């Protein structure tokens, strides 16, 4: 069930997606996702359904009732779906597939046909909606960032560095910056559109922040737009500031022992409405809850039987 202002779920390789709440770390509902693994899951902004996307299908799971089955399934693509998302009023789906495409879907059982396709020469790894719900970022395995506006049908392509695949990109809800990470850990931050009027979409490279010697897998802002957390394959999650882009906080799950040899990577993270407590998904068969100030963990959920690669954490707007 999901009749609560805050919700939390994780997904991975154990063929289940777990829902729980951060009161005592006990699971509420284990929804059965079989025949594939979940790349990414997202909850609907009306807080009625959740969506798990992995390997050629997007499965909806109901939140108000107790149903372990995929009520609505979307198929048609031929490979994986890296990331999905919805309009903030629940009108259209932006889904980035593994093969070559970033497409739109219509959520109503009617012939509206607001669905378009965007085709590039590379397998795409990340999609990100603009906070004004007008533009969209595509990030692929050739290091290219396709700024595609849904009003027109022409798209900008930007290459900071070729020969390296970029993995994630995100824009803070205050619309201040745009950061992105690649497969060597470099995190470039361009200044986004300042042209609120007619969507001119000018970008100037502000900084590149060199960290994360291993692969950097996900970078996300905060809703307060004062912090930015990024997770990397050296079993670390580091939160930086937006003032001078220095290191605010460092978190690690490393045991300090040479007998483990990277027992689990840092796959995903998310902020809260206060930007005070974060929830992190590591591949050590459990998820953690940390604070952005004291450094030490505050909570743990270890009900999974395999690694987990994606997690969803939304709460109420007040915070």
């Amino acid at each position: 069930v999901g009749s609560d202002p805050v919700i939390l779920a994780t997904a991975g390789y154990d063929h289940t997606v777990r829902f729980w709440q951060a009161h005592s770390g006990i699971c509420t509902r284990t929804v059965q996702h079989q025949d594939s693994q979940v790349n990414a899951l997202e909850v609907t902004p009306d807080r009625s359904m959740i969506a798990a996307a992995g390997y050629q299908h997007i499965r909806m799971y109901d939140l108000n009732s107790n149903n372990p089955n995929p009520i609505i399934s979307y198929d048609g693509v031929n490979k994986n779906i890296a990331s999905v998302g919805f309009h903030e009023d629940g009108r259209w789906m932006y889904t980035g597939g593994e093969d070559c495409t970033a497409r739109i879907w219509d959520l109503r059982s009617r012939n509206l046909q607001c669905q378009r396709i965007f085709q590039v020469n590379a397998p795409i790894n990340c999609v990100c909606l603009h906070p004004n719900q007008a533009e969209l970022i595509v990030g692929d395995q050739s290091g290219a960032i396709h700024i595609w506006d849904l009003k027109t049908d022409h798209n900008e392509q930007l290459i900071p560095e070729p020969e390296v695949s970029i993995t994630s990109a995100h824009i803070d809800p205050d619309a201040s910056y745009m950061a992105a990470v690649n497969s060597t850990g470099n995190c470039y931050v361009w200044n986004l559109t300042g042209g609120i009027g007619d969507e001119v979409t000018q970008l100037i490279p502000k900084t590149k922040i060199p960290a994360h010697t291993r692969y950097a897998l996900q970078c996300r802002f905060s809703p307060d737009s004062t912090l930015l957390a990024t997770c990397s394959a050296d079993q670390t999650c580091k939160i930086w500031r937006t003032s001078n882009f220095s290191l605010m906080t460092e978190l690690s799950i490393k045991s300090g022992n040479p007998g483990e040899s990277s027992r689990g990577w840092m796959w995903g993270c998310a902020f809260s409405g206060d930007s005070q407590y974060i929830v992190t998904a590591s591949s050590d068969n459990l998820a953690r809850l940390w604070c952005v100030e004291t450094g030490e963990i505050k909570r743990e959920y270890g009900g999974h039987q395999k690694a987990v690669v994606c997690l969803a954490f939304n709460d109420s707007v007040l915070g």
Binding site: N69, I72, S73, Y74
Partner: peptide
């Protein structure tokens, strides 16, 4: 008669099968 049991099998599983939209 094998066809009657196969018909029973198909109707019983088809009753549970069709419950979702693709």
């Amino acid at each position: 008669s094998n066809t009657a049991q196969r018909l029973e099998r198909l109707r019983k599983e088809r009753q549970n099968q069709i419950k979702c939209k693709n």
